[PDB]
Structures are given as structure tokens and as C-alpha cells.
Amino acid sequence: GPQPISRLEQCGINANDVKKLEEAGFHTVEAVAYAPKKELINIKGISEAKADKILAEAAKLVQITTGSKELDKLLQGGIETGSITEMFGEFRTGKTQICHTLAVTCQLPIDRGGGEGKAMYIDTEGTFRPERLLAVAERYGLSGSDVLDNVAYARAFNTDHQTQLLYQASAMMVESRYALLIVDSATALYRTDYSGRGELSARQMHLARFLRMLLRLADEFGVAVVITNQVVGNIIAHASTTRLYLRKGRGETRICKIYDSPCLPEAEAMFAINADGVGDAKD
Amino acid sequence: RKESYSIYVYKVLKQVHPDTGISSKAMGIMNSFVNDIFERIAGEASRLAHYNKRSTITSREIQTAVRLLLPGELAKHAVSEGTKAVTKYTS
Amino acid sequence: RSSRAGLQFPVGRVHRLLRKGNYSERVGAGAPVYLAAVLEYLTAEILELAGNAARDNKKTRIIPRHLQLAIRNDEELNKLLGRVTIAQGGVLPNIQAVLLPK
DNA sequence: TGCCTGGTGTCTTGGGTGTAATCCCCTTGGCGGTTAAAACGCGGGGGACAGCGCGTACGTGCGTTTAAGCGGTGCTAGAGCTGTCTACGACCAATTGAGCGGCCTCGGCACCGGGATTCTGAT
DNA sequence: ATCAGAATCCCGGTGCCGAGGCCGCTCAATTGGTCGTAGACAGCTCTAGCACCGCTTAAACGCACGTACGCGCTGTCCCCCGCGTTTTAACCGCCAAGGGGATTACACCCAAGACACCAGGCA
């Protein structure tokens, strides 16, 4: 966690210099410490000697239910909060529907398979429907209005906007308790933006940074991170903890397969897409 | 192809000693010499430009590099020749 | 890229320094990774030995003296830094045998 | 006058990196002589090395003095940063002449030989 | 001082092969124009380098004295030099061959697309 910069004054930095460091926007001893001298020196009323004293003394101090029961059993009860679970599958498999369902189930009591936290829906595809959220909320008997109140929503127009929303997510997730972060068509902007072959490393780098920010937020807030992937990157293998393959069974009933878990078996479960919900298959 | 300073060394030789020749081995040593001093001066000039956050190597960097690398009278005469050459060239 | 390479030293920064140091017109993707890894390793070897010296001296903080002891007491580091001066390092204790009393 | 029921078929590049086939001449390999250099033996002399004496220069200690160090204060020169803009260097296409590879020849140098001079060591 | 002998230097002759020059060619430097940008200059800030005063005290300094070490001298013996004799292998020249350095010819991956084709008479 953080090591608030207050602790730096006990090292014998005078408090005025700490206030100037806070003015710069450095608020922890960790924050000042792993930065060079010039950042603290550039602050008004701070010399190089005080900065050397600061750096030297600073180094001294520094399960959400899927709502398909059969799928929950496949997952041993639902998504583990604090980790990334990847569901890769074809279009029309219900990925957007699953996102809408989870956006509400996260708000469920933990004893009901929720995280008792607010939800975060980052859309890149325009498919965000508050009315679908209302349907899922009424399914689980949650207030649809409260679902929208526990879902902060923003549509990312590009990869840069996609990463920029993470900055708002990190500061906003501190102020309110969240349990779910949704990124729908998470890989589409990496395909439309990064379309070249020479750009493979570029999309991989942007994705890597995006994933690292995701991991930091997951470890920071203990929330579930849900991203959706269409498989028509090898970087995701190390990053996803649980890989789910989704394929259509005709009508509204979908087949789920586990394609990676270091602990969980490779296995499959059948579920359906119902007006209210993403919910177990009911032949 | 494969470059050397041989013809220029020979022209200079003809300037200072009109009736004197030079062996193949000796010419090889002169070529080694010119390349060596080129590398020393160019390298120092490169560092001079870098230290001062300049992207251009100018005659001033060459001159300073010469002052750093050459001893005493060699340095003074070399500086004189470079300056003279640049002045003759400019007009 | 540092995380991708499993490193602590900054690959991006090393890449930038390679680009702006006028070493070559082009720089491969693996070059700054390799360089960063080497710099990190050597840093680790010197810090390992210097830490050892610091503890031998019952000190918890590494000072230049410990760096000098670490470097000069290690044949290969001593070789690598043969023409290098460590400020405030001092020298290894060493008295020629002929100078000692009989 | 008023009636149904029948399956089975193909064939299609693009971009940007690693491999063997090609090939030729020098690097590697051997033979043969011949001669200069290396190997070996030996005598001896001179140089390394150990021992000894001495005298003087340097280490040690002490009283004096000198200035380095530290701490505060003052100010101004100049390092450092920012803004602007223009000169200057990258870049690019057409031209061409300087520079390089190849060929040829003659003169500087090298090899040989023989006399002169130098130099060394024994007398 | 002298003198003989061994080594080197010098002087001249002959040869030979590499340096110097010439010529074809080709590609790299030059010229002319354009454009972005970098660095030259102005100006402002504010850091730190220089200057100073005063007090303290630890370091420098001058000197006395004793003695350990540098240095000169002497003897010894051993081991390196220098020279004669034998051996050997480096060196010169010539030939064979092959191997690797430089040049030309050859897969693996993701990409999805694309519809056609009517026939057959009885009681």
C-alpha cells in the first residue's frame, strides 16, 4: 500500500518541505522516494540539499456469482474478486449479456454471490444498455436504478482513451467500494487501432500496460476484472487466470468450456441467455 | 570499394620532399595513422557535442578536440592550419 | 518492457539513451533489453559483495568503503574497474612483509 | 378421371525472415633441400649476493605557533531555464570528375663480394 | 702505446620487383533548391561561489637525539657468456585440394471466401 509522505518528516525533513512535496502532488514516502531529486527540487522553496535529504531518508522508510449456478460450480462458486477472468468466445455468445448480468450480480450480497460493491462498465462497442441492467436487477431482485448508480460508465473510443479511463477508475474506485470492472470488446480497439504487422509489438505493449494497471487496481481494491475477447494474443495467457471458451448452442443456450486454469480442470458447462439474466441452461 | 588515404599522403609527400618515395609498408602505417587521428578527433568532438546537448559537430568542436588531444606546439600549429583552411574555404 | 523482460532496470529509458547517444542509425528491439539486463546484473554483483562487506563491518548501510572493498577483493570486478577511482573508497589493508619487525 | 418423389457436387496469394546450392582460390596440406639457426658442452670471469662497518639521515617525541576548519552572514556573478526566430544542415535529384583497380615499366634498394676502417683484448 | 684479428662499414656492380605513372570507369562528391529545427541571442531567476570575521584547536613546524638503514667495501662461488661443434627444422619453392567466403535460389503463418442443378407418365 501507500506510505504517506507524513512519515518523511520524522526522518528529519522539515515539515514545510513535506508540504511543498505534497503541493507537487507527491503524497507518500514511496512516491517521493522512487522519483529523482529534480522533481522535489523543482518545487518552489526547495533546494537540492533538502532534496538529497529527502531521497536518502525516504529510501530508509520505503467471490462474485456468475448467476449461472452450473457455471458457478464450474468456477467453484463464481468469479474470484481481485483477479482477472477472461471469457473468450464468438459474437452473439452473450458476452455483452454476461457483462450486463455481472454488472448487477456484483452488487448482490456476498452471501448471494455478489461482492457487495459497485460495478464498472467500460464500453468500447456501444452495446451498453441500462435497460438490460434493469432486467438483470429485477431478475436478482436488485434495484435497477441502484445498479446504474453502482455502475460508472464510459465508452472508450480508442486504446489511448481505453487506458485513460483507467486513470479515472483508479481515483474513483478509492472513493467508492467497487466489486466489478467490465471491459466489453476489450480487444477490439487493439485490432482497429493496431492493424499492422509491424504494430504487433505496439498493441502488445499497450495491452501489457493496460493489464498491469488492471492488476494493480485488482490488487488494490480486491475487485473482479472482467474483459471480453473475440478469438477469430499470447501475452494474455500469462495475464488471464481462467480462460473460458464460449460457443453458441442454437436458440439462446450457450456452451462454456474451460481452456485454462492452473488449478481448475478443463471442463464444460451449459448455460442459457434469458431475458432477465445470464442463467443456467434450462432445456 | 576499399578506401585509403594513400594518394593524398603521396601528394603531401611530394610537397615536402619532391624526390622522395615511400614503401608499401610505410604507406600502410601512414594510413593507419590518419585513420587513428581521425577517430580520436571525431570521437572527442562527438562527446563535446553530446556534453553540451548540441546535435551538430562544428569546426569549434573540432578545434577544442584538437586542443584536448594534441600536445603543445602540435596543437597550436594544427589549430592554425584548421582555422586558415576554414577561412580560405569560406570565401 | 521491463516487466515483460522480467527486469528491474528501465528498458524504455535504456532504449531512449541508445537512440539519442548516436551509436547507430537503427536499434533492435532486443538490444535495450539485453543491455538493461547486463547493467542490472553487474549492479547486483557489486551490491551483493558490498552488502557482504558492510555486514562484516557490522554496518547496515553500504558506504563507498564497502564498494571499494567489494571491488578490489574480487579479481574480475577489480579487473573490470582497473582504471577507476572509487571516491572515499580508501585502499585494501596491505603491508609488505619485509617492512614488519623481525 | 385422377394420380408423387426423387442427392451430391471443390479450390482458391499475400509480406518479411533462413536455408541450401553454388564456386573458386587461398588457406591448408605435403615434398625436398639447404643452410642458418638452435642445441649442447665447456671454461672462466665477472657479477650476484652475503657479510660487515659506519655515519648520517630519518623516525619519534615535545613545545610552540600557525592556519585550517566551522559557523554565520552578504552579495553578486553566472548557471540555468524559457521564448523566438533565423541561419544552417539534412535530404534529394542530376551531373561529372576525382579516385580506384588494373597494367606496365624503370630505378631504388637489396644482395653479393671485396677492401677499409673500427674496435677490442692481450701484451 | 701497440698490434693483430674479428666485426662492421663502405664502395661498386648486378638484378629485380615494387613504387610510380597512365588510363578506363563508376559512383560519390558537387550543385542547386527546399524545409524543418536547433542553436544563438535576449532576458529573467535564483543558486551558489566568493569574500569576510571570529573563535578554536588540531595540525604543522622546529628542534633534539638516538639509532636503523643506506651505502660502500670485500670475498666467494656460481652461472651466464662466448665460442666451437653437431643437429635440426625454418625457410624457399612447388605443387593439390578443399573449404569457406561471397553469390544466387527457396517455407511458415492468418487470411475466409464461395451456390449450383430439373427430372419424369401411368391405368
Swiss-Prot record, chain A:
List of residues binding ATP: 89-96
Taxonomy, superkingdom: Eukaryota
Tissue-by-tissue expression: Highly expressed in testis and thymus, followed by small intestine, placenta, colon, pancreas and ovary. Weakly expressed in breast.
Alphabetical UniProt keywords: Acetylation, ATP-binding, Chromosome, Cytoplasm, Cytoskeleton, Disease variant, DNA damage, DNA recombination, DNA repair, DNA-binding, Fanconi anemia, Isopeptide bond, Mitochondrion, Nucleotide-binding, Nucleus, Phosphoprotein, Ubl conjugation
Induction (record text): Stress-induced increase in the mitochondrial levels is seen.
UniProt GO molecular function: ATP binding; ATP hydrolysis activity; ATP-dependent activity, acting on DNA; ATP-dependent DNA damage sensor activity; chromatin binding; DNA polymerase binding; DNA strand exchange activity; double-stranded DNA binding
Residue ranges occupied by any HhH domain in the UniProt entry: 28-57
Cross-link (Glycyl lysine isopeptide (Lys-Gly) (interchain with G-Cter in ubiquitin)): 38, 44
Chief location of this protein within or outside the cell: nucleus
Region (Interaction with PALB2): 146-219
Effect of residue 38 to R: Impaired ubiquitination
List of residues that carry Phosphothreonine: 253
Motif Nuclear export signal location, chain numbering: 207-222
Annotated GO biological process: cellular response to camptothecin; cellular response to cisplatin; cellular response to gamma radiation; cellular response to hydroxyurea; cellular response to ionizing radiation; chromosome organization involved in meiotic cell cycle; DNA damage response; DNA recombinase assembly
Listed result of changing residue 237 to T: In FANCR; dominant negative; impaired function in DNA repair via homologous recombination; impaired DNA-binding and formation of nucleoprotein filaments; impaired DNA-dependent ATPase activity; no effect on subcellular location
Residues carrying Phosphotyrosine: 34
Comment block on domains: The nuclear localization may reside in the C-terminus (between 259 and 339 AA).
Family to which this protein belongs: Belongs to the RecA family. RAD51 subfamily.
NCBIfam families in alphabetical order: PRK04301.1 (NF003301), recomb_RAD51 (TIGR02239)
Name of the protein this chain belongs to: DNA repair protein RAD51 homolog 1
Organism ancestry: Eukaryota, Metazoa, Chordata, Craniata, Vertebrata
Swiss-Prot record, chain B:
GO cellular component, one term: CENP-A containing nucleosome
N6-succinyllysine: modified positions: 2, 84, 88
Modified residues (N6,N6,N6-trimethyllysine): 53
Residue numbers of Phosphoserine PTMs: 4
Organism: Homo sapiens (Human)
Omega-N-methylarginine: residues bearing it: 54, 60
Keywords, comma-separated and alphabetical: Acetylation, ADP-ribosylation, Antibiotic, Antimicrobial, Chromosome, DNA-binding, Glycoprotein, Hydroxylation, Isopeptide bond, Methylation, Nucleosome core, Nucleus, Phosphoprotein, Ubl conjugation
Post-translational modification N6-malonyllysine, affected residues: 84
Keyword Glycoprotein set for record: yes
Subcellular location: Nucleus; Chromosome
Residue positions where N6-crotonyllysine is found in the record: 2
Positions where PolyADP-ribosyl glutamic acid occurs in the chain: 3
Positions where N6-(beta-hydroxybutyryl)lysine occurs in the chain: 2, 53, 84, 88
Gene: H2BC11
Modified residues (N6-acetyllysine): 53
Residues with PTM Phosphothreonine: 83
Modification sites for N6-methylated lysine: 84
Physiological role: Core component of nucleosome. Nucleosomes wrap and compact DNA into chromatin, limiting DNA accessibility to the cellular machineries which require DNA as a template. Histones thereby play a central role in transcription regulation, DNA repair, DNA replication and chromosomal stability. DNA accessibility is regulated via a complex set of post-translational modifications of histones, also called histone code, and nucleosome remodeling. Has broad antibacterial activity. May contribute to the formation of the functional antimicrobial barrier of the colonic epithelium, and to the bactericidal activity of amniotic fluid.
Entry keyword annotation includes Cell membrane: no
Protein name, entry field: Histone H2B type 1-J
Segment of the intact protein contained: 34 to 124 of 126
Gene Ontology terms for molecular function: DNA binding; lipopolysaccharide binding; protein heterodimerization activity; structural constituent of chromatin
Positions where Dimethylated arginine occurs in the chain: 47
UniProtKB/Swiss-Prot annotation, chain C:
Modified how: It is involved in the initiation of both imprinted and random X inactivation. Ubiquitinated H2A is enriched in inactive X chromosome chromatin. Ubiquitination of H2A functions downstream of methylation of 'Lys-27' of histone H3 (H3K27me). H2AK119Ub by RNF2/RING2 can also be induced by ultraviolet and may be involved in DNA repair.
Subcellular location: Nucleus; Chromosome
Chief localization: nucleus
N5-methylglutamine PTM positions: 88
Sites of N6-(beta-hydroxybutyryl)lysine modification: 20, 79, 102
Annotated GO MF terms: DNA binding; protein heterodimerization activity; structural constituent of chromatin
Modified residues (N6-(2-hydroxyisobutyryl)lysine): 20, 58-59, 79, 102
Modified positions (N6-succinyllysine) in chain numbering: 79
GO terms of biological process kind: chromatin organization; heterochromatin formation; negative regulation of cell population proliferation; protein localization to CENP-A containing chromatin
Modified residues (N6-crotonyllysine): 20, 102
Cellular compartments per GO CC: CENP-A containing nucleosome; extracellular exosome; nucleosome; nucleus
Domain of life from the UniProt record: Eukaryota
Modified residues (N6-glutaryllysine): 79, 102
Keywords, sorted A to Z: Acetylation, Chromosome, Citrullination, DNA-binding, Hydroxylation, Isopeptide bond, Methylation, Nucleosome core, Nucleus, Phosphoprotein, Ubl conjugation
Subunit structure: The nucleosome is a histone octamer containing two molecules each of H2A, H2B, H3 and H4 assembled in one H3-H4 heterotetramer and two H2A-H2B heterodimers. The octamer wraps approximately 147 bp of DNA.
Protein role: Core component of nucleosome. Nucleosomes wrap and compact DNA into chromatin, limiting DNA accessibility to the cellular machineries which require DNA as a template. Histones thereby play a central role in transcription regulation, DNA repair, DNA replication and chromosomal stability. DNA accessibility is regulated via a complex set of post-translational modifications of histones, also called histone code, and nucleosome remodeling.
Family stated for the protein in its record: Belongs to the histone H2A family.
Protein name: Histone H2A type 1-B/E
Naturally occurring in which organism (per UniProt): Homo sapiens (Human)
Range covered out of full length: 18 to 119 of 130
